[PDB]
């Protein structure tokens, strides 16, 4: 199978990626020095060279020099091609306008050049994985830019992303609703499907299951690394019933706008706690169908599932996966919409996970990642829309935007567009 390009935008995406690429190095046994120790898989995510040093096929962009500087000076400095690390001069300062209109465009073209110079050097190409956040300038405004530009230059190719959605109650910035909605509007028409994640839900899981009292960003971003490696496992490792990258959108996207499947991973168990667990197929399969196991803090029983992919990993029994899924289809609490009787998409790859040195999670012999699309996520959008209406009703932060080349009417258009999305979910939530 063939190549994929990973774009890491903003502090969150850039910081998340460094953890993700640590896994790829471990799985294929690539040295942090870049030189593979003395096979057909790494070609998808790594570029060959005359020497033994493989070059990762990804680009990092961040208007603030600080974040990339840590990578550019960290022990992984030699792994990345120096010209792939694009850095501006000043930060976007959490303002959507700066990262999209004034300073985002001053460096966007340079990023396109390297991607173009990178996409041209792959005999095959699947799509893009874009890592970013919803609550920052570079990770929200610059993302919207690249979705537009990459859509034009490389349209009709898959465009996937993993976005840190604003958590329900915990908040890390004041202008998250303003910046969160804006990027959503511009990215709906130029994206395939977004893999939402919340730090609140992940924190809730980490203190609950993993059983470590004091998590950090350096900890959580690694779990987000596992979902990516499991998602991209088909493109690298052989196994029965593979699932190529272009397959995700077809199964998980009944409608063009409705492309927000929240991520769910299992089993998250610590090394010590695992000795008293059996890890049967239904056990791990059942873990994905409860409020207590989500990367987004949306109560699934509030809504109805409409598409679910169970990308199994490691030594797995297809017979049990077929049987385990069948039971979940016949439980009253679980409720698939009326119009999608065919609501599962199984995928198996014969490569059990690999543990990061010193990693908190255990060495599970078998793993599964669920990518269910549920109408309960409309609550997250509904709550977010409530926040935006409260602030913009008083016009309490617009001035920071109008001064950066963003017209007043944009805010009104976005919410009205989001309001239609709210109704779109409601219509799909019923049966004609």
């Amino acid at each position: 199978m063939r190549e994929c390009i990973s774009i890491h935008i903003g502090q969150a995406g850039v910081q998340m990626g460094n953890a993700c690429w640590e896994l790829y190095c471990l799985e294929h046994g690539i040295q942090q020095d870049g030189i593979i120790p003395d096979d057909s898989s790494f070609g998808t995510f790594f570029s060959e060279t005359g020497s033994g040093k493989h070059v990762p096929r990804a680009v990092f962009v961040d208007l603030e020099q600080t974040v990339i500087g840590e990578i550019r000076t960290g022990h992984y400095r030699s792994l990345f091609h120096p010209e792939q690390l694009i850095t501006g001069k000043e930060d976007a300062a959490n303002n959507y306008a700066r990262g999209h209109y004034t300073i985002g465009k001053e460096i966007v073209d340079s990023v396109l050049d390297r991607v173009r110079k990178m996409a041209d050097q792959c005999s095959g190409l699947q799509g893009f994985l874009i890592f970013h956040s919803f609550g920052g300038g570079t990770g929200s405004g610059f993302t919207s830019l690249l979705m537009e530009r990459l859509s034009v230059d490389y349209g009709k190719k898959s465009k996937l992303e993993f976005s840190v959605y604003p958590a329900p109650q915990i908040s890390t910035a004041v202008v998250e609703p303003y910046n969160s909605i804006l990027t959503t509007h511009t990215t709906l028409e130029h994206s395939d499907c977004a893999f939402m994640v919340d730090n609140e839900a992940i924190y809730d899981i980490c203190n609950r299951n993993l059983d470590i009292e004091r998590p950090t960003y350096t900890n959580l971003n690694r779990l987000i690394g596992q979902i990516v490696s499991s998602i991209t496992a088909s493109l690298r490792f052989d196994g029965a019933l593979n699932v190529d990258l272009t397959e995700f959108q077809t199964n998980l996207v009944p409608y063009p706008r409705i492309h927000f499947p929240l991520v769910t991973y299992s089993p998250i168990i610590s090394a010590e706690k695992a000795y008293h667990e059996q890890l049967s197929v239904p056990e791990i399969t059942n873990a994905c169908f409860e409020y207590s196991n989500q990367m987004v803090k949306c109560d699934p029983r509030r809504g109805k599932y409409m598409a679910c992919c169970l990308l199994y990993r490691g030594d797995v029994v297809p017979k049990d996966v077929n049987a385990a899924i069948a039971a979940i289809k016949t439980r009253r609490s679980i409720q698939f919409v009326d119009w999608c009787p065919t609501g599962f998409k199984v995928g198996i790859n014969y490569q059990p996970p690999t543990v990061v040195p010193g990693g908190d999670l255990a060495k599970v012999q078998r793993a599964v990642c669920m990518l269910s699309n549920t109408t309960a996520i409309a609550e997250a959008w509904a709550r977010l829309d409530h926040k935006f209406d409260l602030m913009y009703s008083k016009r309490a932060f617009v001035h920071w935007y109008v001064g950066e080349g963003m017209e007043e009417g944009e805010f009104s258009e976005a919410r009205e567009d989001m309001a239609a999305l709210e109704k779109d979910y409601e219509e799909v939530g019923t049966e004609s």
């Binding site: 699947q126 077809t250 199964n251 297809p318 017979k319 119009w339 998409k345």
Partner: protein, 430 residues
């Protein structure tokens, strides 16, 4: 003489194909390197039925492997048995279908189908008398469903007279491994009823039911399910490859098993099936073998034959056997379950006996059935299709690759007629 050229499309087809050629190489006693090392002269007398010959004894099977992306083919070439195949026969794209029928049939399969035809013709001209074509694919997928139906039509146009049979995996009744199976399944049937002479419907759930029920082997990987399918399909072609008392033929089965042109969907069956260890507490005589062919428990199609009625049935026996019992039991079977067979056909059972049993066995019978109960499957797909199509659940992935929703309505309408036609023969005479 009556050469077979094998076509395999999609991940399921290649994986079944790969296992399918291991057994035939085993039956004929062919080394993985392509060098014949069997012990019976009957293996070389018909080795040309599947295998071409290059100087030096290197026998190159004439299988055509097509998948829209190198994923599954690369595994085959790297597999222990992959060196046997001709390097040219492999045909690989660079962007696999995303399970959607349109891309693998119209926009991506079209760019690759012409390349495949260029090799299939070379195989056709190399055979003195090419009997027909054999296709192994899956309806649920995109590459198998799309390019298989695209290619089955193209080979149909060039060689209308020849047989063109297919082995396809059919969506399971209650489990689905792909969300959009009804769309791909319904679209693929519409294009098949009009172009294929026979179809051996199989489904994983029914085959799963065999693994643990009659056999006792929990954790049966796809590599084992394909072996059951491999064995059944190799039985259909046995008479072409070894002598027998009552030889069968790909055209013989088509004539007997297909009363009307459209009603050619069969469902296979195999025996003897018994778990290791417990095998020694069971006899291998013909009587117990025959009963194992006429019970739902040993049917590889999820549809239960009891609900419906049998139209035509063919039993292809193998090994040294008493032809009396091979025909006495069929008569008793028909009188025992007369209600299970329609009255308007005076006799329904077709018997064929071969001399060489399967490798590692002294008795084998590949059952084939044409029952009205299969209408339940297509009716079930109709139930799922109308539900999804009533709201345009996923039409945008299809119309975006050069397709019109008018085709979906055409396929649904045709499918309903196929179900109706089966129903009309539920009634008795007069």
């Amino acid at each position: 003489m009556r050469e077979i050229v094998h076509l395999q499309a999609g991940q399921c087809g290649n994986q079944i194909g790969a296992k399918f050629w291991e057994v035939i190489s085993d039956e004929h006693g062919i080394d993985p390197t392509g060098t014949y090392h069997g012990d019976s002269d009957l293996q070389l007398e018909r080795i040309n039925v599947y295998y071409n010959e290059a100087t030096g004894g290197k026998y190159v099977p004439r299988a055509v492997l097509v998948d829209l992306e190198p994923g599954t083919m690369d595994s085959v070439r790297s597999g222990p048995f992959g060196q046997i195949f001709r390097p040219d026969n492999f045909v690989f794209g660079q962007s696999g279908a995303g399970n959607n029928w349109a891309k693998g049939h119209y926009t991506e399969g079209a760019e690759l189908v012409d390349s495949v035809l260029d090799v299939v013709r070379k195989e056709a001209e190399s055979c003195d008398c090419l009997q027909g074509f054999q296709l192994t694919h899956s309806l649920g997928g995109g590459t198998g469903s799309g390019m298989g139906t695209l290619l089955i039509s193209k080979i149909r146009e060039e060689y209308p007279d020849r047989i063109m049979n297919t082995f396809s995996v059919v969506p399971s009744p209650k489990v689905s491994d792909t969300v959009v199976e009804p769309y791909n399944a319904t679209l693929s049937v519409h294009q098949l009823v009009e172009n294929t002479d026979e179809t051996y419907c199989i489904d994983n759930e029914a085959l799963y039911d065999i693994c643990f029920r009659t056999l006792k082997l929990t954790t049966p990987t796809y590599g084992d399910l394909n072996h059951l399918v491999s064995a059944t399909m190799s039985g259909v072609t046995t008479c072409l490859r070894f002598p027998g008392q009552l030889n069968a033929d790909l055209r013989k089965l088509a004539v007997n098993m297909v009363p009307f042109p459209r009603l050619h969907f069969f469902m296979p069956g195999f025996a003897p099936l018994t778990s290791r260890g417990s095998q020694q507490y069971r006899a291998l005589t013909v009587p117990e073998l025959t009963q194992q062919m006429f019970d739902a428990k040993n049917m590889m199609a999820a549809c239960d034959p009891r609900h419906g009625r049998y139209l035509t049935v063919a039993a292809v026996f193998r090994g040294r056997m008493s032809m009396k019992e091979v025909d006495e039991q069929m008569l008793n079977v028909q009188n025992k379950n007369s209600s299970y067979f329609v009255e308007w056909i005076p006799n329904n059972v077709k018997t064929a006996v071969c001399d060489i049993p399967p490798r590692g066995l002294k008795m084998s019978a590949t059952f084939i059935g044409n029952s009205t109960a299969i209408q339940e499957l297509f009716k079930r797909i109709s139930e799922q299709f109308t539900a999804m199509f009533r709201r345009k659940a996923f039409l945008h992935w299809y119309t975006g690759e050069g397709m019109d929703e008018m085709e979906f309505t055409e396929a649904e309408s045709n499918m309903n007629d196929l179900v109706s036609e089966y129903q009309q023969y539920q009634d008795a005479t007069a």
